[PDB]
Amino acid sequence: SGFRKELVSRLLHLHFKDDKTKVSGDALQLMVELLKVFVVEAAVRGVRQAQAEDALRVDVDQLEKVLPQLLLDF
Amino acid sequence: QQRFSYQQRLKAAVHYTVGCLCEEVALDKEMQFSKQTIAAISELTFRQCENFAKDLEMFARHAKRTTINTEDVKLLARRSNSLLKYITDKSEEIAQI
Amino acid sequence: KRKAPRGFLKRVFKRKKPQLRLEKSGDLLVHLNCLLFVHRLAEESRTNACASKCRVINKEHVLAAAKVILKKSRG
Amino acid sequence: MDETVAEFIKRTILKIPMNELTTILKAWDFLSENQLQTVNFRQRKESVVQHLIHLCEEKRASISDAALLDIIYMQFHQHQKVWDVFQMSKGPGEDVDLFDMKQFKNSFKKILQRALKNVTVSFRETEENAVWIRIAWGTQYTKPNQYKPTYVVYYSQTPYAFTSSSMLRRNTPLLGQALTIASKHHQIVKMDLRSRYLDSLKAIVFKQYNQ
Amino acid sequence: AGLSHYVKLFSFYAKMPMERKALEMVEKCLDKYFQHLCDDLEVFAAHAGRKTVKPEDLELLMRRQGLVTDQVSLHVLVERHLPLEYRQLLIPCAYSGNS
Amino acid sequence: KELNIVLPEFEKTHLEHQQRIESKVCKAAIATFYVNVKEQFIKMLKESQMLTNLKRKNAKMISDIE
Amino acid sequence: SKSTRDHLQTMMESVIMTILSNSIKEKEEIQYHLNFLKKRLLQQCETLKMEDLTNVSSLLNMERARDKANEEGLALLQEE
């Protein structure tokens, strides 16, 4: 289905360096949108490089190969 | 002690939900996400959400503000034109809610 | 070479965008932007030329260098 | 446009000096007359070795003529990789009435891939009637090693077949073995002429030096 | 012009010989860099609410490249690359009249 | 050789931890971790089988040569 | 074989990851289990590649498949 409100209500607030800075519910659901599509695009990029190697399984090595671009534009 | 007790529960939550999303995408493209694959993709999502947290606070700081507005996450979608056009209509959907 | 151009940077900024007000020393800061851009491009071109083990920088290395550097240097 | 094929072509192109680019590249016929004008030969080395390799990227180069390019390179650089000279000897009887180039290229490749199953044997029948074989060796466990091939200049109907003394592996008794089976001979004998000048070995063995 | 000066900088920043047709490709690479810098600056300033772009709108874009960090602040990078008079105008020195 | 002793050492640890177990769900989590350790020991045994198969290939790299 | 056992700790930490995903209602219990897992680390690392071993083991597996192909080839050709 997707990321939940209780999930991103704690995950994003873990790393915040100030205790008084929060994320609103309408913005929290957009964090849901972008973190869901984060897995979605990471998965489709991995599937696409697997298709470039014409493979049925995606492994750790191709993910490490795309990281220099995965963290780069996405 | 707080580091372990925190990051354990956060990556456990995100990996639970991305396991749900892996069963969700595995039926879209009829592929199978291996255990090492889901573990790697969840940890990549986590280490990138690290930069997301580094990002959004300074994005508010840039416009002299503390809270996170929809423009702060709009510049999050600015990173690529594809997810620009995506998160635009998803933000219109959020406004629909 | 120890140089930094005032005029051409502002002309490029005006040509690419007719609506901006680059401040008195903002030209200086965009020149630093491109300084660090070209530094990153030079070093990563050395890197990917070592990946191809070519002793002279060529078109194929810098073409791959563009899609990485200008993509992370993008905001 | 393959693995150890485009790279092998690149590695054998810069070996040749700047003067003989056209002379060597006209021979292997991958670059038709139209393709020669696209690459400017006179600027630099790394520019020509990059545009020439691109011209076979679009031509979908294969090892079969990638080895052939090395063959024409060696025909203008036969004065390196000091040559052995093998001497065949039939028994009593008539000559080889059927030394077909097709049959010889078949009867050498068949016997060489019978045991050395992973080799890229590439013949180039020269105009002086001297089949210029080049064998990229390698056992069945490994891919054919094009780094150090063993060129064999078998003069077509002659008992003598010069061989580049590259490594002298366990293949040198099989190199003569397939050479004496493809050419319908019976015995292979290294006559013990080991000189680096192939055009000088050819005169000595055939007694063509003072005639 | 500016791109021509920049590829001249590329000669002493790559420290290894180049080709003219390759520097003509670095020309379009620099133009392609600016075609992103000018409309990334516009949006970073528009979120800031200013039709002009100020220095702090550009240290944020620096953070977007990520070459400025908590260890290497904005004022650090100007030190390593720009000359003395070209660096006097960005970072505030102190004469009781800090720039 | 050493893998047989390593498997026993790993198996004794699961029982040592289960002696200090507190809840039934914790026992299930420990059993799952023991199954994961069995999978890791199977990976180690696969490494040993890979060494044996490499020895066979070395014999197969000489039988073919012979 | 140290980095091998830190990669071991990585993969049974992925097992930790999944059990914690299904067992989020055991936070203190699984934290104790985590301390005991660091204890397992300290216990077998002292006494005594994997991804590379797996990949090269498979690679040598089809290499030896190609090898038994060369064996049936050479043996049958020698037999004929």
Residue of B nearest to A40 (CA): B25
According to DSSP, residue D43 is labeled S
Q: Is E96 left (phi over 0), alpha (psi -120 to 50) or beta?
A: left
CB D159 within 8 A of CB D186: no
CATH of domain C6-73: 1.10.20.10
The encoded tokens of residue B33 equal 């996400």
CB A62 within 8 A of CB A43: no
Identify all chain E residues contacting C36, using CB atoms and an 8 Å cutoff.
62, 65, 67, 77, 81
List chain C domain ranges.
6-73
According to DSSP, residue D163 is labeled E
Here the CATH number for the domain that contains residue B29 is 1.10.20.10
The encoded tokens of residue C5 equal 């151009």
Minimal CA–CA distance to G5: which of B42, F12, F50, F37? F37
Residue of D nearest to F61 (CA): D141
Minimal CA–CA distance to E44: which of B85, A17, C7, C30? C30
Minimal CA–CA distance to G1: which of B43, B40, F2, F35? F2
**Nearest CA distance, A59 vs chain C (angstrom):** 23
Q: Where do the DSSP E strands lie in chain D?
A: 83-89, 120-122, 125-126, 130-136, 150-155, 160-164, 187-190
Candidates B13, B57, B72; nearest CB to A11:
B13
According to DSSP, residue D61 is labeled -
Identify all chain A residues contacting B37, using CB atoms and an 8 Å cutoff.
46, 57-60, 63
Beta-carbon neighbour count of residue D95 at 10 Å?
A: 9
Residue G63, SS3? Answer: helix
Query: What is the C-alpha separation between B8 and A54, in angstroms, rounded?
Result: 35
Query: What is the C-alpha separation between D41 and D22, in angstroms, rounded?
Result: 8
Q: Is E60 left (phi over 0), alpha (psi -120 to 50) or beta?
A: alpha
Residue C12, SS3? Answer: helix
Tell me the C-alpha to C-alpha distance, in Å, between residue A60 and each of A67, D116, G30.
11, 37, 27
Beta-carbon neighbour count of residue D13 at 10 Å?
A: 20
According to DSSP, residue B31 is labeled -
C 13-52 → E contacts, CB under 8 A: 13, 16-17, 19-26, 28-42, 45-46
**Residue A28 is which amino acid?**
L
According to DSSP, residue C56 is labeled S
Residue among G61, G64, G66 with most chain D CBs within 10 A, to mutate: G66
Do the chains contact at E49 and B63, CB–CB below 8 Å?
A: yes
- Does F16 contact D at CB distance below 8 Å? no
CA G23 to chain centroid, in Å, comes to 25
**Nearest CA distance, C68 vs chain E (angstrom):** 11
**Nearest CA distance, C51 vs chain E (angstrom):** 16
Q: What is the 3-state secondary structure (H, E, C) of chain E?
A: CHHHHHHHHHHHHHCCCCCHHHHHHHHHHHHHHHHHHHHHHHHHHHHCCCCCCCHHHHHHHHHHHCCCCCCCCHHHHHHHHCCHHHHHCCCCCCCCCCC
Residue among E7, E23, E41 with most chain C CBs within 10 A, to mutate: E41
Query: What is the C-alpha separation between C16 and C14, in angstroms, rounded?
Result: 6
**Residue A39 is which amino acid?**
V
Instruction: Count, in order, helices (H) and strands (E) of chain C.
Output: 3, 0
Could you give the number of structural domains in chain B? 1
Beta-carbon neighbour count of residue F36 at 10 Å?
A: 18
CB D153 within 8 A of CB D84: no
According to DSSP, residue A56 is labeled S
C-alpha gyration radius of chain A: 16
Residue E15, SS3? Answer: coil
Q: Which residues pair with D126 in a beta bridge?
A: D130
Query: What is the C-alpha separation between D149 and D144, in angstroms, rounded?
Result: 9
Do the chains contact at G73 and D141, CB–CB below 8 Å?
A: no
The encoded tokens of residue D110 equal 């068949």
The DSSP bridge pattern shows strands D187-190 and D83-89 to be antiparallel
Note down the domain range covering B71. Answer: 1-96
Cα separation of the two ends of chain D:
48
Minimal CA–CA distance to C13: which of E34, E40, E1? E34
Q: Encode A33-66: b = buried (16+ Cβ within 10 Å), e = exposed.
A: bbbbbbbbbbbebbbebbeeeeeeebbeebbeeb
Query: What is the C-alpha separation between C70 and E44, in angstroms, rounded?
Result: 17
Cα separation of the two ends of chain B:
40
Question: F65 Cβ partners below 8 Å, 6+ apart?
Answer: D139, D170
The encoded tokens of residue C22 equal 């680059």
Query: What is the C-alpha separation between A11 and B14, in angstroms, rounded?
Result: 8
Instruction: Find where tokens 């940890």 sit.
Output: B43
Query: What is the C-alpha separation between G76 and G71, in angstroms, rounded?
Result: 8
